[PDB]
Amino acid sequence: HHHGKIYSFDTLANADLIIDAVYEGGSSGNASDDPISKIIKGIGNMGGFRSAGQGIFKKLIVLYTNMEDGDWPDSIDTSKGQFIYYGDNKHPGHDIHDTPRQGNATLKMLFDSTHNEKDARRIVPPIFIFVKYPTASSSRSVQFKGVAVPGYPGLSATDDLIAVWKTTNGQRFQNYRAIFTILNIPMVSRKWINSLFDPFGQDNSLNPFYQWKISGKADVLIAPSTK
């Protein structure tokens, strides 16, 4: 059994983001143990949906899932470079778009931008995907799954963002099922990450993202399994 690179908690602040590398969380027991907010300054330390930047139009979005709940089956298909992600309305209470972190409202904006006939993809920021990946030293450890963009080649706008119904204790409510493409980006450099708020100081790490922004045609991370 072989392992990808594993970053200890005290090495996170200047780490690169590497496909399927593991980033260990803290041991203090408290909130600051969150590995994601240590890796990326500007990103909060809690939530399935996180963003950086002030304004309606963010600089970066992070999607985080624990992959533990069968009711909301988030998944990655490594052979297709496809990520299926459920939105932030997981309980009865408010309308699908009425959520504290505004994940669902933002998902709607991002997919509508992606499929818009005018200014297509204009407001879409880079999206980073992390999944919970417990290690011995920490249960808050995560794994980077890649840079992602809304939609998937061959999927219609009807299919890549669906309001699905669920029932909880007899109460019916809606939540988004969103489908993303994982880009062929093996690494996001520390230089890029430190230069999140300024494209001038960025390197070429996200060139496939900027290409997608221009054309709407993604260079997909296609990774067939070994037997």
Numbering used by the authors: -2 to 224
What does the paper say about this structure?
Here, we report the apo-structure of the DNA recognition domain of the cytosine modification-dependent restriction endonuclease LpnPI (LpnPI-N). The structure of LpnPI-N was solved at 2.1 Å resolution. The asymmetric unit contains two almost identical protein molecules (RMSD < 0.5 Å over 209 Cα atoms), with slightly larger deviations observed only at the N-termini and two flexible loops (residues 24–26 and 51–54). The largest contact surface (∼750 Å2) is formed between the N- and C-termini of both A and B subunits that encircle the 160–170 β-hairpins of the symmetry related A/B subunits. This ‘pinching’ interaction, however, is not functionally important, since LpnPI-N is a monomer in solution. The overall structure of LpnPI-N is very similar to that of the SRA-like DNA binding domain of AspBHI (RMSD 1 Å over 170 CA atoms). This allowed us to solve the LpnPI-N structure by molecular replacement using the AspBHI-N structure as an initial model. LpnPI-N is more compact than the corresponding domain of MspJI (224 versus 260 aa). The loops connecting β3–β4, β7–β8 strands and E–F helices are shorter in LpnPI-N by up to 5 aa; nevertheless LpnPI, like AspBHI, contains an 8 aa insertion in the β8 strand that breaks it into two parts.
In the present study we report the crystal structure of the N-terminal DNA binding domain of the LpnPI restriction endonuclease (LpnPI-N), which recognizes the modified cytosine in the sequence context 5′-C(mC)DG-3′ (where D – A/T/G), and provide mutational/loop-swapping analysis that supports the structural model for the sequence recognition. SRA-like domains were recently identified in prokaryotes, where they serve as modules for the modified cytosine recognition by the modification-dependent restriction enzymes that protect host cells from infection by bacteriophages containing methylated, hydroxymethylated or glucosylated DNA. The modified cytosine base is extruded outside the DNA helix and accommodated in a pocket of SRA and SRA-like proteins. In summary, we show here that LpnPI recognizes the context of the flipped cytosine via several surface loops that act as separate DNA binding/recognition modules.
